Write an enzyme that holds these catalytic residues in place. Structure first.
Site, PDB file in Angstrom:
ATOM      1  N   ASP A  39       7.631 -12.460  -5.657  1.00 23.59           N
ATOM      2  CA  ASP A  39       7.439 -12.082  -7.054  1.00 23.59           C
ATOM      3  C   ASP A  39       7.233 -13.313  -7.938  1.00 23.59           C
ATOM      4  O   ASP A  39       6.629 -14.300  -7.495  1.00 23.59           O
ATOM      5  CB  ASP A  39       8.646 -11.244  -7.506  1.00 23.59           C
ATOM      6  CG  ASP A  39       8.296 -10.221  -8.565  1.00 23.59           C
ATOM      7  OD1 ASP A  39       8.062 -10.617  -9.724  1.00 23.59           O
ATOM      8  OD2 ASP A  39       8.283  -9.007  -8.252  1.00 23.59           O
ATOM      9  N   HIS A  69      10.270 -10.743 -14.497  1.00 21.91           N
ATOM     10  CA  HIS A  69      10.025  -9.621 -13.591  1.00 21.91           C
ATOM     11  C   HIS A  69      10.731  -9.813 -12.247  1.00 21.91           C
ATOM     12  O   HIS A  69      11.431  -8.909 -11.768  1.00 21.91           O
ATOM     13  CB  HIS A  69       8.510  -9.451 -13.441  1.00 21.91           C
ATOM     14  CG  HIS A  69       8.083  -8.290 -12.601  1.00 21.91           C
ATOM     15  ND1 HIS A  69       7.865  -8.405 -11.245  1.00 21.91           N
ATOM     16  CD2 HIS A  69       7.732  -7.023 -12.931  1.00 21.91           C
ATOM     17  CE1 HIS A  69       7.439  -7.249 -10.769  1.00 21.91           C
ATOM     18  NE2 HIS A  69       7.349  -6.394 -11.770  1.00 21.91           N
ATOM     19  N   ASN A 161       1.231   1.669 -10.646  1.00 18.06           N
ATOM     20  CA  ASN A 161       1.561   2.279 -11.931  1.00 18.06           C
ATOM     21  C   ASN A 161       0.348   2.892 -12.617  1.00 18.06           C
ATOM     22  O   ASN A 161       0.255   2.885 -13.848  1.00 18.06           O
ATOM     23  CB  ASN A 161       2.208   1.263 -12.867  1.00 18.06           C
ATOM     24  CG  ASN A 161       3.439   0.622 -12.274  1.00 18.06           C
ATOM     25  OD1 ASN A 161       4.224   1.269 -11.582  1.00 18.06           O
ATOM     26  ND2 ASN A 161       3.635  -0.656 -12.573  1.00 18.06           N
ATOM     27  N   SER A 224       7.603  -1.154  -9.720  1.00 18.27           N
ATOM     28  CA  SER A 224       8.267  -2.425  -9.443  1.00 18.27           C
ATOM     29  C   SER A 224       9.780  -2.304  -9.466  1.00 18.27           C
ATOM     30  O   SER A 224      10.460  -3.118  -8.838  1.00 18.27           O
ATOM     31  CB  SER A 224       7.896  -3.461 -10.498  1.00 18.27           C
ATOM     32  OG  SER A 224       6.571  -3.917 -10.345  1.00 18.27           O
TER      33      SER A 224
END
Length: 279
Positions: A39, A69, A161, A224
């Site tokens: 990530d 994130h 998404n 996520s």
């Protein structure tokens, strides 16, 4: 063990019903397992990680998470308050820049890095990788995820998404990894969650409280956020000896809460991750 006033997603994964707020789990808590969070990095100094997080690789000028994130996802895997597997070891691999973007070539390199790097770590209970990232279909990205899984790592990836079929996204569309959709606290499919036959499981993904950079916390939404619930669950179940990296996705599907989500399109699994812990 019981954690009172837990984030709703933790309570959901140990419950046969929505609408409760205590997380119940075996005290082994993923001890002896390892989860790689591939990530934007991890703020390992966050008190919530208790010294159990560390950066092992970056492809950029710093290994620090300048976005948040990756720290949020890592918190859902394994932070003391916000995490599923509260005693796992967390390893950060920074394939995404501080804007949250990364080239597929870098992401592929990061996956092959984890497949080798686990041989440099002590993970007697097993190894998991959480990939809260993706883009358009790429056979090379899918193949890298398949290699990582084949090497003995439980790979959990975000469905995406786009409120669309995940068959058109990578690594979501790779059959051999665990592709995770998102649900909300009322057991509805999250409005943004991708769907389709390639999904293996749903996890909590709307309004998920976790760690953030600057020693902070915040609630955000996405597939996520669902992905690290599943990655942490895999680590927890592997530590219990109930499953292995190669079989954990199937085991999670076998033991999921079934038929309880609304707005699941015909042809997509109606399965919600569940730890089956009996206190």
């Amino acid at each position: 063990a019981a954690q009172t006033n837990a984030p709703w997603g933790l309570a959901r994964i140990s419950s046969t019903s929505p609408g409760t707020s205590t997380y119940y789990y075996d005290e082994s808590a993923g001890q002896g397992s390892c989860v790689y969070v591939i990530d934007t990095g991890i703020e390992a100094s966050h008190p919530e990680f208790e010294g159990r997080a560390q950066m092992v690789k970056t492809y950029y000028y710093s290994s620090r998470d300048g976005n948040g994130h990756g720290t949020h996802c890592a918190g859902t895997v394994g932070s003391r308050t916000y995490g599923v597997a509260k005693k796992t070891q967390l390893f950060g691999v920074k394939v995404l820049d501080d804007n949250g973007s990364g080239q597929y070539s870098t992401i592929i390199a990061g996956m092959d890095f984890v497949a080798s790097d686990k041989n440099n770590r002590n993970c007697p209970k097993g190894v998991v990788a959480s990939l809260s990232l993706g883009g358009g279909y790429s056979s090379s990205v899918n193949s890298a995820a398949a290699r990582l899984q084949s090497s003995g790592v439980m790979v959990a990836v975000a469905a995406g998404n786009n409120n669309a079929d995940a068959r058109n996204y990578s690594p979501a569309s790779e059959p051999s990894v665990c592709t995770v959709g998102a649900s909300d606290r009322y057991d509805r499919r999250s409005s943004f969650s991708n769907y389709g036959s390639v999904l293996d499981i749903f996890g909590p993904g709307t309004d998920i409280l976790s760690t953030w950079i600057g020693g902070s916390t915040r609630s955000i939404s996405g597939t996520s956020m669902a992905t690290p619930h599943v990655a942490g669950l895999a680590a927890y179940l592997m530590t219990l000896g109930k499953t292995t990296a190669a079989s954990a996705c199937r085991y999670i599907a076998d033991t999921a809460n079934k038929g309880d989500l609304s707005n699941i399109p015909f042809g997509t699994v109606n399965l919600l991750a569940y730890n089956n812990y009996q206190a």
